[PDB]
Design a protein around this nucleic acid. Sequence first.
DNA 1: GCGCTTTCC
RNA 2: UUAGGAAAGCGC
Length: 698
Amino acid sequence: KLNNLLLNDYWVHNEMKAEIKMFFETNENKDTTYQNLWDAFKAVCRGKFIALNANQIDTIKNDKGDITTDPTEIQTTIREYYKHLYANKLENLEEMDTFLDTYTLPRLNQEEVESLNRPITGSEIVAIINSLPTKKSPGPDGFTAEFYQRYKEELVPFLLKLFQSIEKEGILPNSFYEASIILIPKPGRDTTKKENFRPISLMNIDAKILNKILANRIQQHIKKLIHHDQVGFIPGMQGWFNIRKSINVIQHINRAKDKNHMIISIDAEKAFDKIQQPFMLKTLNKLGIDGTYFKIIRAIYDKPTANIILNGQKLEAFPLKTGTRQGCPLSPLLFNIVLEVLARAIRQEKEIKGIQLGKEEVKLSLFADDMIVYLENPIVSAQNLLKLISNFSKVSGYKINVQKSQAFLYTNNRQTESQIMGELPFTIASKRIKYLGIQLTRDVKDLFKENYKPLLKEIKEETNKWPCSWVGRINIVKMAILPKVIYRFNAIPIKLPMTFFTELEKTTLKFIWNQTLPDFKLYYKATVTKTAWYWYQNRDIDQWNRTEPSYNYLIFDKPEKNGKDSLFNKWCWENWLAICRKLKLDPFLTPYTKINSRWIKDLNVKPKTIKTLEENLGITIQDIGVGKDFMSKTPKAMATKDKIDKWDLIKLKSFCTAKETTIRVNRQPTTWEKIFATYSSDKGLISRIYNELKQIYH
DNA sequence: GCGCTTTCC
RNA sequence: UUAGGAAAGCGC
Ligand SMILES: Cc1cn([C@H]2C[C@H](O)[C@@H](COP(=O)(O)OP(=O)(O)OP(=O)(O)O)O2)c(=O)[nH]c1=O
Ligand SMILES: [Cl-]
Ligand SMILES: [Mg+2]
Ligand SMILES: [Mg+2]
């Protein structure tokens, strides 16, 4: 193992910088591969550092209550358990082909495929090295990320040749197959049971650099491969999309006169560990992923092994015949791609009936391995779901974790309820289901009780178990309390009573003063109001936003007469209007009002006219021009008049040319309006809205 | 752009 | 001997 303190020494740094250069001159131009040369180099750098210098598992309990405190017996039991877990690779290759051919799967085009097979560059390697985390343990070879950062200039030309030889032969250095497994406890589980540990992998930094490059390449096309129902590990997606969608679906069932529904929360057992490698490679081929990229993935999964590090010892290696390492940057994407085969199958199987919410059919919400399935007529639909999952399990290794899976079941009588319960492997919850850190409730009326009441109590528990200045104590509230509170608001932005904030302010101020500060009321307002950004963007992926019992919620538009039983949108709207009132802003007809708006549609204008104006001139009424500027700001606008229906042109001129329209639309937009209209990304919305709310309410 | 924490898996 | 991925915030 490398001591990072040695890299700080001028004499060691110069002696090493020269030894690296002297190795690649003496040993290059020999009867050897770049793969074996790299491994020999690491072995030589290792010995040169030695010459220059010249977490406990105490008890394991079985299913019968017998324990062992013997280090050898604990090591044997643990090693035998993990060895068996990763031992059995499936051989039913024809059945894998059959399942994959059964459903319609996406496929990368030649442009996307060439982007994956694009040769690795030195600048690609450099950027990864620069972003490597510091103060972390090395992999089994002993080299920390700091070794690669310190000798970047000398190593990158060599790493590039190594990676170029890997992309030619599909052969890796032997060390690229090694990893250390560290066993970490799973929160709140019994730590005396061997199955309640999470096996975390520490791979060598050189292999992690290659894997991060491969992960970055496929992540560029992940939106094409994964349907928007999956938000776990996906860039630009939020877990609260699934939470709010699930809650509106529960409210729909609550309001339905005919109960014949089921909401199933399925967790996969040891999700990354049980992935079948031949099924994963076949799935990548099915999506068009082939060539150089595929060859490298295949080489990575050829003969990986693991050495468990337990109680001062490095245990004998075992092969990883199953799974993708927890700790490898490629693993989240390859897992999601495999699970996506099941997700496509569920959505495509009409005999697995989803919940119809008007024109929206809801059926699935995914967050990494967690699936929420929304079913109608579960006596048939849940049985077809379990059958499909069983067939996927046979080819992929997928397994339902029965102890972590639960369902809400809604029927009209006890007879159908018992008939359904008796045919399912997981339990029926009668009050709540923990999902993404929050409690989904069987009846949406219990949301405040099961989420915000426990939150106030757990914040008192954080301040009780917490030698610090009042300035440092304000930072503890900001670092640890604030994210828990914002997370809950984002998940369930329901109307909260003032009493919630009064008690939250009391618990917080007492902790700071021992019996800028975060304004929890303004963070709440920012989070609630933030939803209006999604209303304006009107994205196809935002199905969560189209699940309320409702008369559209639109900003920068003429409001409708107006639902009454809205959990989130009505409350968002009321906050939006109150903030606009405080800003002395007319928010109904503005420079950001769209051409496709109630303002234009109420003139009885044709949708073809709206489309013609959008495709030729832009998206807002301001783009087409108001007053003297009406369809005359550019030669393109003047000519576009000839493509518009004669009657609609007169209606539009009458509206756009009116004095009231001209004053409201041709004005200058405020900072507040720009936050909600001019940003194509939703990143940092709470920070930007909160910052504006401070400059208005303080 | 750098750094730090938190939520989820 | 705590890795990884996405997301959120705080901060100069
Ligand atoms: C919690 C967690 C998950 N993951 C990945 C790998 C996991 O297999 C996957 C799903 O996480 P989990 O569902 O939390 O765990 P699991 O599926 O491994 O095991 P269990 O049977 O207890 O459900 O997400 C990490 O890489 N690191 C983590 O810290
Ligand atoms: Cl027209
Ligand atoms: Mg997509
Ligand atoms: Mg799981």
